[PDB]
């Protein structure tokens with residue numbers, strides 16, 4: 001399977017916060033779905049190498065490297081390495 | 096040394112949130128002072144095996160597993176495995 005998503009914790013009503021663990025197979029590309037205005041997303045690489053397209057530009061992130069950005073803007077996740085990439089996606093929804 | 100701490104992101108003023116990576120050497124024990132009242136913490140194991148003491152009780156956590164708990168309680172981290180343990184710690188402060 002190209003992309004396997006698993007919540008690390010259930011939806012957190014108090015913190016308005018989701019925390020997902022995602023494994024992206026070699027060669028897989030995933031485009032973000034739309035989010036509510038004001039959502040903030042953090043991506044942190046756990047293992048492997050991840051390519052993130054943010055503000056129309058690609059960058060490579062290595063383990064324990066991360067990026068914080070506007071989750072409501074189009075972005076993409078891509079694995080151009082030869083092994084799965086495991087990363088976390090944290091989402092803070094606005095109050 | 097026994098414990099190596101690294102911020103994954105700098106302090107987030109708007110989200111009142113810290114995010115750290117920690118590596119505990121075999122046999123290491125870290126006893127934290129309780130954080131401010133209302134603080135919520137999450138811990139996720141990246142690799143290895145982590146023991147955590149919450150509510151005066153020890154439990155062992157493995158990769159992909161995590162726990163959410165009240166940060167203003169006393170708690171502790173310990174590595175009783177023969178390998179280092181690498182984990183992430185999230186801290187959310189009250190707004």
Ligand SMILES: [Mn+2]
Nearest residue numbers: 127136166170
């Ligand atoms: Mn702590």
